[PDB]
Point group: D3
Chain length 290, copies 6
Amino acid sequence: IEALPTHIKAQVLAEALPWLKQLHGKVVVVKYGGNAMTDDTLRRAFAADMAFLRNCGIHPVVVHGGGPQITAMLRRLGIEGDFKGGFRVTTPEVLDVARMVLFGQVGRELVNLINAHGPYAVGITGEDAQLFTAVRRSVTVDGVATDIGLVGDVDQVNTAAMLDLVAAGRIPVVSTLAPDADGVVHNINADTAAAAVAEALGAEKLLMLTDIDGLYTRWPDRDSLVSEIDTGTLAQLLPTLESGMVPKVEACLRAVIGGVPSAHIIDGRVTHCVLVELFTDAGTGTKVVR
Amino acid sequence: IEALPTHIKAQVLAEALPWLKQLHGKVVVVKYGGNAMTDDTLRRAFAADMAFLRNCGIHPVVVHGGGPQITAMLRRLGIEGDFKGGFRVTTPEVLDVARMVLFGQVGRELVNLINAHGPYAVGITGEDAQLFTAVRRSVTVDGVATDIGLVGDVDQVNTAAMLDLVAAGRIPVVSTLAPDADGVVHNINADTAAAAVAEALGAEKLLMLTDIDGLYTRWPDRDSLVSEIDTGTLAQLLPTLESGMVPKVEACLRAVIGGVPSAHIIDGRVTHCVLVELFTDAGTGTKVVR
Amino acid sequence: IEALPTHIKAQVLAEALPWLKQLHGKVVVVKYGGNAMTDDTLRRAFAADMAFLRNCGIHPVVVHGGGPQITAMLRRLGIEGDFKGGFRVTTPEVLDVARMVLFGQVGRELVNLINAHGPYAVGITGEDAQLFTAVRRSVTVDGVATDIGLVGDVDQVNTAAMLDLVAAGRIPVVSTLAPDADGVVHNINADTAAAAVAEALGAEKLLMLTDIDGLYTRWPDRDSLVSEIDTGTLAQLLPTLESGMVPKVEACLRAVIGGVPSAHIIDGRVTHCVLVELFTDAGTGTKVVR
Amino acid sequence: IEALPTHIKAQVLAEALPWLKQLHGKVVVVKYGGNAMTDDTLRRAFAADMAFLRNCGIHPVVVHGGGPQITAMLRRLGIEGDFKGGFRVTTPEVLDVARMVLFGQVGRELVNLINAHGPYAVGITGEDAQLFTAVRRSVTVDGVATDIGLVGDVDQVNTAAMLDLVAAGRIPVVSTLAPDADGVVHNINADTAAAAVAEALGAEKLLMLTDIDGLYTRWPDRDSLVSEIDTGTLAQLLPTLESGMVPKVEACLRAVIGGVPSAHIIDGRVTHCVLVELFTDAGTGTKVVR
Amino acid sequence: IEALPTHIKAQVLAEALPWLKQLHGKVVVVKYGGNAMTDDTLRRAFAADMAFLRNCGIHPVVVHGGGPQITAMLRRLGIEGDFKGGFRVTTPEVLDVARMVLFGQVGRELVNLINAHGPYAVGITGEDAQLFTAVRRSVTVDGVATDIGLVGDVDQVNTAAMLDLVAAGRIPVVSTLAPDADGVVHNINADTAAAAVAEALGAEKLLMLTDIDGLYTRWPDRDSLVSEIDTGTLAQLLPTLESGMVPKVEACLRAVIGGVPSAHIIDGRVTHCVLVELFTDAGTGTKVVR
Amino acid sequence: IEALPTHIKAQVLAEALPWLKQLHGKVVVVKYGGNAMTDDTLRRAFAADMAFLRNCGIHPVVVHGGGPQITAMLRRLGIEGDFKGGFRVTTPEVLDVARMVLFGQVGRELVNLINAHGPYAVGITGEDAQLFTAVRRSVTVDGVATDIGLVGDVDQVNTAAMLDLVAAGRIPVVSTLAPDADGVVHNINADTAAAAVAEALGAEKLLMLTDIDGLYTRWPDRDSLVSEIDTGTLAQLLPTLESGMVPKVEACLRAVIGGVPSAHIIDGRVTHCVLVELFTDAGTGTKVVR
Ligand SMILES: COc1ccc2[nH]cc(CC#N)c2c1
Ligand SMILES: COc1ccc2[nH]cc(CC#N)c2c1
Ligand SMILES: COc1ccc2[nH]cc(CC#N)c2c1
């Protein structure tokens, strides 16, 4: 990268100014998952990008999944799954394992990676300082609403306490597990939790790290890819998308309808995707507005 | 407990005043382990006692072990141990498991128990916000100093950041794992870590929850039990005590020599031991001064 | 009190937790009078109980009477009383004496007693920093409303300035004398003033130290005594009670109707009554709610 | 005062600027006694002058005596005096009376007078919030040091707590009674206490209201009067002055040696003396420096 | 001024108290121009008067004109004027000169004069920290509304940022030039700007330094001069006054209608006019209320 | 700039992180002059670069010259110069013009340019709030020290007040004129003033905008250009450099000897030079250390 003239190194920097000003002093919630989380080079760049934001006076908040890791640990422990539709029933035993893996393993990697750049990252769940609570969610399989155990949605968020942490110059790394109103800890889908914290905290943007270029109208036509779309005409598209796409899209809808100015679905496989989406116009993602 | 006259209910309350005043606004570090951690009734009372302290304007800081739990999980995972002397070699694989169990399991139970009383408890390791670092410790077996993997002592403690958390009305529940200077996470003996945070934070007292009445001069003579002892004549006794006793006693020495006014070894098997040691003279523990 | 097993010393302490949490950070106004004020052992315990509250992070505010002391000083000075019904006409001369005795004698004893435990207690009247004002009250004798001099009710209270003092960790000891709108100092009935500060400050509880077990429905049937009663059915009882009882009861009504959660009439003759009423269920008092 | 041209009304105002700047944000301790305290017109002007200072952002602190009032009350109460030399033995009974008169009568008049201008004045003794302590003083009669009861000197002053009160925009009116180290309240000579608070608080000036023009070298030569004098050559004069003069002069010495820039002895019989001494060069007083 | 008895030096000082209290902690906007700005003795006294206010804890804000100075510099530069009616067309070239003279010359004199008394004065325009903006004003000549270049009225005022400066103990010296919404700097009539800042800042008073005794009903009858007048009956007089008088009077109307308690037109030729108007009843000015 | 792949737009951004972290929360003093000040495209980019820094939470402080502009205005005014050696004698008349041009013209352009990006820029001299003072400097011509009027060096700097302005999120644009100890305003060489504020404020870096590539050892050998040099071996070179170079180099020496970590001489003719020097390694400048 040394053979690039110094006068264009300058212009790409200067073209970040309007987004630097837009984002200065603002909350940005980032849901992190996919291959940006399993490849060492992508995950290092993500950590560095969160340190970037922080050394700009932007306030990143990180929400992480970990689905495959939970599966692998359950298998190492020889815990037999029960399945309704294609969901695993989260028994008390499976919650324990899930909590142990998300907060004790996956979140620790990200904290330590970010903290190679400074004393920034701090891991939390809904359990810590009652930062947020959960309500038992139910799922519908082949038409009928069914219970699949200790799985919930984010209920309410201690907005104030949360915003103090970011003000101290700290980056919350959020494992999505939280008590219900009786203290019973539930596991929350990370895409959903991200949307819910973003709306609670009054975030400026919600970034979705996903394993695709962006939202395709009529997959797999290459002509279908989109830069930007509103909630109205997005929700009208929701019933068509592939199974894996629904969660990333419903979170974008819940967030932007919730008042977040824009939610973004960007390519977690691109190294430094967070930087390209926030500080350049060459975004491969797709932006969502009302 | 209803058949006790109301005029003696009053006196036992009034006799807490001199310790309430002594402890108001002060840091108390509590190392929690043993049966006060595995029996539901004792562990609930401990949680309630930490909420007590906090609703008095005292600042409890909780440091927890978890030795047996780590063993059990390693066995469930079929991870083969390597042993020098009688210590397990903490490989990278064993650290991961240890971190996962201490922070993702054992610390979560205590956080949720305390948080039945309010939004108080918050789990941390040395990794979070770089709250403290570790230095690789070595051990001596049958005379020779030997390496037993990623096991360390607390190196340095972010005293300021730590004291802000307690000031926000929060109870840190500390899992004793911390980066070394190269970011490599080590597991720290919980008795040692407790002594080290206590000295760093300028704690007023260090409480040691242990599975005994107190320190016996010449075990097992019942006539040997002691109420109070200084560092000088305690250190002269250290080479005699049973293997399990050394860590609880060396931490008391490192802490009180470090400037902590008094370290206490109290009976974790007594329900509400923390209350009896802090607010009554009927302590079964043994106090340590210089 | 040493022959009581250490495991019950613990339980009576632990049973204070729910009231400690309820009262942490809250204002409690205590009207102090009667024999809890003239016996050295009771008055010392009261002082110690106010230091207790303060070393729990509770905010006590003390309002005191002094009726008998004023009488005695007037008699020592040979000041002749004028009496309408059974009230003394508070002339300018009698106000001076009253102020001198309440603020210069009775309030000083309590300040010095409390301040044996720390730099806590601070004496004030309505005159100091204009903390509250008075409006000339009139009385009805044998049916007709009559003037009995410079006697008033609390008019308005500098709520903000008052709440700063408690925040500095100080215990206001309030002598109930205050300017009217023309600067003319009036003497205010202490039971009434207590109710009025309690409502102004948003106190959590109002404690009434009185010389009885509690409120009797149909005195002197022992079967008449009550633990708890609301304002509606209390006010319906007011026209029956003994002359001395009216002031303690009307203050409870004005306070709980004013929004104070509960007012209490407790036995000032019991040593440490404040402790038993606040931190035990063995209360001899009687609680008042709406 | 209306027949004075408006162009000289202006100049006398403008000539206050250098003292306004010198005194802005500074502590000025004023000992108030004498006829400036017994004549209604002088005492009203003094009150108004303290409100002046405060509405300039200067920090007045008022210390008051009351010797004659104590005598009169003791006589009304028929309390027999015991006298060694010409001092009254302050028995426990005489302390009580003294405290009652100084704090409950004399200090109340001044508080209410000042508070005709705003919520400024606040009465205190050493007892309140432990603002200062006393040490038992002894006196020498006809050569021998003799005990004359509960009379002391100011020992130590809670400088910080005191300076917070002035910062809240409050004027402390100080009755000079304070606990000794065992809680035993003593009466302190007001001239002495004034010097001691002035030095503790780092006052800019100490003002002494006295019943004379100023310090005369060789009284009663009119040619003897002085504008200014240092400590060295003042102390050399101390053994000559009239009995009543010693206390006003020793306080000036203890204060200016203590580091207070200048102590002043001014004419309490002049209406608005405080204003003339602080904001004009036409001072009748006498200034003291090192 | 030394031959004036010290007892009347005192009374004129004491008669400032009610205005000192009224103005303590309040904003006073002063428009400064005329001969109080060109004579060295008057301008020094004005500077000293602003230091007076500040060393009383009053918050002066200074707005200055400079019409004649701009003319003189334009003439020295040989810049030819264009005139519609009797107004100069402010071209880009004339703005530059105006800004250069007002902010770089006239405002510097006043800053340095005030700052002989302390680190008080600070020069600003609407350009600095976007403290206020301008909207292009038009004028009506012989009946028709006409453009006369880059001349505007104060549009909106950064009230908060402005009030922080005064709180730091600083005196803003305001040159009345400000950007429009496109960044194009305009020159604002100083009388108008003064009224607009006064209303924005919630000033207690607006002082107008002008070259006259006060507002005459039917000039030049000496019997016409007035002490006080409301907005209603003032506005009904506006169409009659001399050309130079309109701006001083319309600003008084815009300010007092805007909520400022009183605007004053005082005699800038009297040395220390600000002092006489604020702290004496011998005002030659004329006060305006609703 | 659109034809550049998005994966290299990312890398140049990511390579700013180590300088972003180094500079976060730090003071950077920038001396601005030369063609970066007279060409519209360069001066706009400079303004934008100062907004960049500010929207990163870096604290820029701008010091500006204006030599040629002063000359031009003096010539337009027909003010005859007096010259000793090749310096103009700054008479009172020339100071006035200099102040008027620097603060009223040159500084206004930069303030308005920066303030197109937000309410950031604020113009000051040493006169405002006494932010810094000057001491009359003398010059040596052909060997002899000679007076050339009201020209000085920065004497002392109100470090605290200055650092508050930057903390409020404001960018001081400094015209280098300041009072001496008698209030007599002097003109200060801008290169010198920049070095002096940088050292006073504890700046992290001093940036020098100059019209060259960088410091040449033996000009004009192209082989002479340097990236980095310490003070020792730089000072040994000072006696050789071209006349225009001395001021830029002596300021670098006074600053880095004064404790500033690094001073930089960079190419004001490169658009966005500030960005390239601070956030890229492709610097054309030359860095100075001890
Ligand atoms: C109050 O909310 C929380 C929750 C978890 C936390 N971990 C570390 C900190 C503070 C630091 N450094 C913290 C705060
Ligand atoms: C502002 O209200 C008051 C009234 C009386 C007081 N006495 C002592 C203090 C403060 C201390 N320590 C105080 C404050
Ligand atoms: C924030 O608004 C402004 C505008 C101009 C200023 N000049 C000097 C200061 C602060 C100081 N000392 C200042 C503040």
